[PDB]
Amino acid sequence: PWSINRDDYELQEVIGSGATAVVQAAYCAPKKEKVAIKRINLEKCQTSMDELLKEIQAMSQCHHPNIVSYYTSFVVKDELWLVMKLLSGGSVLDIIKHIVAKGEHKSGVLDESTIATILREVLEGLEYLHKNGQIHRDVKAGNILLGEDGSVQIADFGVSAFLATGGDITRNKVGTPCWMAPEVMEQVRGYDFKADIWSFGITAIELATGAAPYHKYPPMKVLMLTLQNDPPSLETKKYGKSFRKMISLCLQKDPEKRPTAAELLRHKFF
Amino acid sequence: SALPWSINRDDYELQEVIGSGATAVVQAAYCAPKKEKVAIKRINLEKCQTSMDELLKEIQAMSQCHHPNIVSYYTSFVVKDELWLVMKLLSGGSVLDIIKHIVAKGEHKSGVLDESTIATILREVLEGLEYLHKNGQIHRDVKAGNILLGEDGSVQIADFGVSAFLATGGTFVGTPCWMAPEVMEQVRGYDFKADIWSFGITAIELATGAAPYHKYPPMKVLMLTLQNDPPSLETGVQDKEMLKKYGKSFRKMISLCLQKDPEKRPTAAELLRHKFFQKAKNKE
Amino acid sequence: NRDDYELQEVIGTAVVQAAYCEKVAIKRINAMSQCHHPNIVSYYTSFVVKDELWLVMKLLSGGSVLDIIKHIVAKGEHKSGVLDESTIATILREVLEGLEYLHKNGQIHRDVKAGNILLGEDGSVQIADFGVSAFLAGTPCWMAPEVMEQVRGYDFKADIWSFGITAIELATGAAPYHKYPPMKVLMLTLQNDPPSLETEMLKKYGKSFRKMISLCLQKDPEKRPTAAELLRHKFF
Amino acid sequence: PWSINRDDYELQEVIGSAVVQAAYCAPKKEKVAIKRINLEKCQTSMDELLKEIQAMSQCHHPNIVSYYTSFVVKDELWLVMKLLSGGSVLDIIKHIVAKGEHKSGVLDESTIATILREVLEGLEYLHKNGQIHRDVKAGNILLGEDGSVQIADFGVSAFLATGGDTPCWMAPEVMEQVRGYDFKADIWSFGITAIELATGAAPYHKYPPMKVLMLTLQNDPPSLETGMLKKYGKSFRKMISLCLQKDPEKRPTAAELLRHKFFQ
Numbered sequence A: 001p002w003s004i005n006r007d008d009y010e011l012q013e014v015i016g017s018g019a020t021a022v023v024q025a026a027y028c029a030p031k032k033e034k035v036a037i038k039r040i041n042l043e044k045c046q047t048s049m050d051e052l053l054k055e056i057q058a059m060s061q062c063h064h065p066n067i068v069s070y071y072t073s074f075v076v077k078d079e080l081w082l083v084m085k086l087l088s089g090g091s092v093l094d095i096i097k098h099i100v101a102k103g104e105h106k107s108g109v110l111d112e113s114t115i116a117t118i119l120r121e122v123l124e125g126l127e128y129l130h131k132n133g134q135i136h137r138d139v140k141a142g143n144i145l146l147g148e149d150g151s152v153q154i155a156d157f158g159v160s161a162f163l164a165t166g167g168d169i170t171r172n173k174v175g176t177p178c179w180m181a182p183e184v185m186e187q188v189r190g191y192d193f194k195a196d197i198w199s200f201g202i203t204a205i206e207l208a209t210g211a212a213p214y215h216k217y218p219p220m221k222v223l224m225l226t227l228q229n230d231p232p233s234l235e236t237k238k239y240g241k242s243f244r245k246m247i248s249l250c251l252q253k254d255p256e257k258r259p260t261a262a263e264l265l266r267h268k269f270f
Numbered sequence B: 001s002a003l004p005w006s007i008n009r010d011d012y013e014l015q016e017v018i019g020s021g022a023t024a025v026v027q028a029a030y031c032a033p034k035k036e037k038v039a040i041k042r043i044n045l046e047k048c049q050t051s052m053d054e055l056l057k058e059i060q061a062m063s064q065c066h067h068p069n070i071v072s073y074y075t076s077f078v079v080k081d082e083l084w085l086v087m088k089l090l091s092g093g094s095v096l097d098i099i100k101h102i103v104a105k106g107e108h109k110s111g112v113l114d115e116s117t118i119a120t121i122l123r124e125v126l127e128g129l130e131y132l133h134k135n136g137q138i139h140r141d142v143k144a145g146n147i148l149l150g151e152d153g154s155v156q157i158a159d160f161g162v163s164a165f166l167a168t169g170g171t172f173v174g175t176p177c178w179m180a181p182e183v184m185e186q187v188r189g190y191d192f193k194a195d196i197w198s199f200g201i202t203a204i205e206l207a208t209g210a211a212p213y214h215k216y217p218p219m220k221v222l223m224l225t226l227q228n229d230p231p232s233l234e235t236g237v238q239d240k241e242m243l244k245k246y247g248k249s250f251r252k253m254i255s256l257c258l259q260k261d262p263e264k265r266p267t268a269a270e271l272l273r274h275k276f277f278q279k280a281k282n283k284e
Numbered sequence C: 001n002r003d004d005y006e007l008q009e010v011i012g013t014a015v016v017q018a019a020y021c022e023k024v025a026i027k028r029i030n031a032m033s034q035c036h037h038p039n040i041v042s043y044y045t046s047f048v049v050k051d052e053l054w055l056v057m058k059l060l061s062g063g064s065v066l067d068i069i070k071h072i073v074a075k076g077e078h079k080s081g082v083l084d085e086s087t088i089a090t091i092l093r094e095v096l097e098g099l100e101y102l103h104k105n106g107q108i109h110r111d112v113k114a115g116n117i118l119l120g121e122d123g124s125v126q127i128a129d130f131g132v133s134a135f136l137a138g139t140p141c142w143m144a145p146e147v148m149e150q151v152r153g154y155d156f157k158a159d160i161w162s163f164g165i166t167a168i169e170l171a172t173g174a175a176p177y178h179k180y181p182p183m184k185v186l187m188l189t190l191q192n193d194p195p196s197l198e199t200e201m202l203k204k205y206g207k208s209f210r211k212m213i214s215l216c217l218q219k220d221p222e223k224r225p226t227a228a229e230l231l232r233h234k235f236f
Numbered sequence D: 001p002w003s004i005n006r007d008d009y010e011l012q013e014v015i016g017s018a019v020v021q022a023a024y025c026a027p028k029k030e031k032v033a034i035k036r037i038n039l040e041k042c043q044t045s046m047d048e049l050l051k052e053i054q055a056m057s058q059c060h061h062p063n064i065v066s067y068y069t070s071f072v073v074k075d076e077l078w079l080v081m082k083l084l085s086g087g088s089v090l091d092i093i094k095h096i097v098a099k100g101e102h103k104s105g106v107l108d109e110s111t112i113a114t115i116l117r118e119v120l121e122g123l124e125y126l127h128k129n130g131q132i133h134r135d136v137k138a139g140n141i142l143l144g145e146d147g148s149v150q151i152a153d154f155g156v157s158a159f160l161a162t163g164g165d166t167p168c169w170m171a172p173e174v175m176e177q178v179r180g181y182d183f184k185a186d187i188w189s190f191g192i193t194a195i196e197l198a199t200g201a202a203p204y205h206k207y208p209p210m211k212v213l214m215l216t217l218q219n220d221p222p223s224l225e226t227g228m229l230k231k232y233g234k235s236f237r238k239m240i241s242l243c244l245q246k247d248p249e250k251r252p253t254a255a256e257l258l259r260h261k262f263f264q
């Protein structure tokens, strides 16, 4: 019962403006609620509504306290508008960016108890998604949103994560495959939920160091450093405990070796 | 008097022009034999792409439908190339005059007319439409511009018949299994329930100052109304938060009227029993 | 110089305490500062104790302008605006004369806001001390704009912007983008029309006030007026 | 079950101020809330509090903050109870008032109905057991992490916040004082907290406490007494007026109130 009439939403301040998406605040009159709208130019992102069908459907079905509330979606001219809850506390990345700008980071960005609190809620959000056979695909500090009540939710499940990570290449998208290399098999099959576990590990480093391990390198070098070398760590301070052990479990090259969200939801760190 | 009302042109002395419209002109006139100052709507038959033959059924209804909440129609006759509709001159102006007055003052953004005032005006409109519908008639053009007020505070619906007919214009070819929805909708027609929708839009107009899609050209408003779910109070409005003043009883009254399926819409008699119309006060 | 100072109530980048000799405020810190003006909180003296730098300044028992705003906002009298246009004009003229003096001495306040507009028992208006914040102070044709920003830095015109935001604050009760995280306000400022009194029936404020605000809140600092040019504005 | 030994409780952060402090209970494994009460300061002893403590042990209801155990630590009485992480309803109110979004009202009418129904069901349980809460207010409505609504401070806390203490020609007030007040006192309190959720504060919040006592006895308050709030209508104001009758006999029971239009 969320309106798909464009004239029921009063567009207000633009929150974000990137190449793929603009995030704009809007007042929805029938629901008397100030909401967030992610506007996506379909032609610019080389995509279509038919291509995003099952993504939108998954967004319509996956609801959890630790996932940003999705309301509805509709087409306005050449854009798809995704209507969701506006979270007034901002992103965890915003907090990280504030600590660095203040110069309160050269001994660690977020406290270990602060990291444990945020990541547990993120992991419970992922646990729900994985239970429903879904993958988030774009876990990062920028996609962890905070409510003014202190709640922690993952943003960008569905369409947004889909367009940021190669499109329809997961398990949700031969012959005699006995001679196929493992990487060929993975392309036929599609990658699984364990991709989220790796991204979670990088996010853990991000909350502590203030950045992803290879942040300074161009995209192609980041990809080459990740594939040619052993998995990264905090070193690339006041952390050395189960936190590093927890990170090393996530950051394993073989996705099979990585733990599930539920198995990870244990561990002494949390 | 009397009488009755004269069909001779020389018996009427033209006076002040009230509205110089794009189709018709409303001019005050004095009727000598009746010793009464009346209102005459002058409709150029050529300009409105019409003749007397198609207007005869409308005039017939106009001469029969007489009710406290319907502007008193007196008579009609042809003067050269135009039809003169003689009616009672009302001194209070229209509800649109009130709206325009508040919109010009800049006191409209948080609402134009309060709920008590709206309830008072529209319940009288409902009594008028109830009368028309029971007589098997449809107004077809209910809007603030067609709600005239008397000096004493009486509320009367204007332009029933010819004017409403002309303002709104006024399964076949092809094979049904292949026909587009909009082709098939042509033979569906409409009844008195069409007035109930228009009444709901009029409710919004008294609150906001305008109809939902007033900012768009005529072809676009057709498109947007037919394409989208029914409009609500803040649909098409610039500053939507500022209309939070209007309560839920008014909003549920509106949503009763504004349903795509006319069979789901209440009758005028049903609407008169709604909670919102208890806010009606003395007539000014 | 020495104390000679009776440690009293806490008011109160560490703490600020009231002290007797006579009503005086001292600020504890974890050189000059020659500025002296009725519209600026300046230091009488500065001396050391034990890992702390004491800064003696005039005690203002009238609180801040934000205190007045917070009382109004806590009540229901911010329906048609917070502070009256006449009260805003009086308070901000004093602040602007304080900024004019600072800028003429090559100084920048760096933190103008209602919380830093302190009020005296006298009814005096002055901007809070800025000395401690002030302590943390080729051929560019081929430079990227993001490189240019660091090289160009900022000057006194930054105070003029903050002054404009403070004008909105006294009328509305808050800075335009108060509901968003601190590190988001840059993006919110740039990706939207220059902040205004509206960025809702809370406005009985005239065009002259809105005009004054718009002058201050121009993205390019060069287009912003000087404090002296602002003092000439019709609003004041 | 729950240990009466201090050693088994590890004191942590202070929640609020009697002082409320969080503590971890190692046997079993649960972070609990412990209220610490200085006996002499409130001019109270264990002897006068025993009847209050035994009632706390007996009461067991989803809408009542779960009381675990009590024990004396030196000159302090420790009340061990469930820790609720959602805070109080007063905290939510205070936040909305501070940012001035209490214009047109504080809590939504639907939100007030849901919260107060749970409170009223909590009160119904207490009254069924012949008990009186004595201190129903928004600050004593605590929220659970699972969205639960629970009444806090039954027994010792509400008792100490309120205090330890031929009729033919006798005045009605005097008769009331000899008999003592009953459960209908909670119903009035309930009506005051309903105004608190809608306006942000009690009806006489302006005037200083103690003067509000004199003002109450001289008048009779509605929602309008605090200070626009037109979104609250019909059955809500009627519900309040039923609670806020001067004659306690004319106030409805909690069970009668749960049948009111405002609470399907």
Ligand SMILES: Nc1ncnc2c1ncn2[C@@H]1O[C@H](COP(=O)(O)OP(=O)(O)NP(=O)(O)O)[C@@H](O)[C@H]1O
Pocket: A015, A016, A017, A018, A019, A020, A021, A022, A023, A036, A068, A084, A085, A086, A087, A088, A090, A091, A142, A143, A145, A155, A156, A164
């Ligand atoms: N629901 C929301 N509520 C509040 N803020 C949001 C919400 N969704 C997104 N944002 C913010 O809007 C801005 C832009 O969002 P987004 O388009 O996801 O940029 P991003 O995080 O850089 N992702 P990407 O552009 O794909 O790299 C960011 O500051 C987000 O934190």
Ligand SMILES: Nc1ncnc2c1ncn2[C@@H]1O[C@H](COP(=O)(O)OP(=O)(O)NP(=O)(O)O)[C@@H](O)[C@H]1O
Pocket: B018, B019, B020, B021, B022, B023, B024, B025, B026, B039, B071, B087, B088, B089, B090, B091, B093, B094, B145, B146, B148, B158, B159, B167
């Ligand atoms: N019987 C009447 N008594 C007094 N005023 C009238 C009467 N009939 C019409 N008017 C006024 O005459 C003016 C013009 O009337 P009309 O020709 O209906 O124009 P309109 O209402 O603007 N319709 P339109 O010109 O097609 O947009 C309006 O201001 C009416 O209020």
Ligand SMILES: Nc1ncnc2c1ncn2[C@@H]1O[C@H](COP(=O)(O)OP(=O)(O)NP(=O)(O)O)[C@@H](O)[C@H]1O
Pocket: C011, C012, C013, C014, C015, C016, C025, C027, C041, C057, C058, C059, C060, C061, C063, C064, C115, C118, C128, C129
């Ligand atoms: N001269 C003064 N007279 C009276 N009060 C003062 C004076 N100077 C500072 N204060 C108050 O001292 C308190 C703390 O001051 P300060 O050390 O500047 O931190 P602050 O005002 O909170 N600034 P910030 O830490 O950046 O938010 C504030 O409430 C000031 O209003």
Ligand SMILES: Nc1ncnc2c1ncn2[C@@H]1O[C@H](COP(=O)(O)OP(=O)(O)NP(=O)(O)O)[C@@H](O)[C@H]1O
Pocket: D015, D016, D017, D018, D019, D020, D033, D065, D081, D082, D083, D084, D085, D087, D088, D135, D139, D140, D142, D152, D153, D157, D158, D161
């Ligand atoms: N079991 C609990 N779990 C979580 N918080 C609690 C619990 N009990 C009390 N609190 C909080 O402790 C703080 C102070 O408690 P209290 O001493 O009861 O003050 P209060 O809220 O004014 N109640 P009262 O003093 O009885 O009127 C309040 O913010 C309560 O919300």
Ligand SMILES: [Au+]
Pocket: A019, A020, A021, A044, A045, A046
């Ligand atoms: Au794109």
Ligand SMILES: [Au+]
Pocket: A057, A058, A059, A061, A062, A132, A134
């Ligand atoms: Au799903």
Ligand SMILES: [Au+]
Pocket: A176, A177, A178, A179
């Ligand atoms: Au094979």
Ligand SMILES: [Au+]
Pocket: B023, B024, B043, B044, B048, B166
């Ligand atoms: Au015509």
Ligand SMILES: [Au+]
Pocket: B061, B062, B064, B065, B135, B137
């Ligand atoms: Au008729």
Ligand SMILES: [Au+]
Pocket: B175, B176, B177, B178
């Ligand atoms: Au057919």
Ligand SMILES: [Au+]
Pocket: C032, C033, C034, C035, C105, C107
């Ligand atoms: Au200086």
Ligand SMILES: [Au+]
Pocket: C139, C140, C141, C142
């Ligand atoms: Au150059």
Ligand SMILES: [Au+]
Pocket: D018, D037, D038, D042, D160
């Ligand atoms: Au106590």
Ligand SMILES: [Au+]
Pocket: D055, D056, D058, D059, D129, D131
């Ligand atoms: Au009991």
Ligand SMILES: [Au+]
Pocket: D166, D168, D169
């Ligand atoms: Au007797």
Ligand SMILES: [Mg+2]
Pocket: A142, A143, A155, A156
């Ligand atoms: Mg994002």
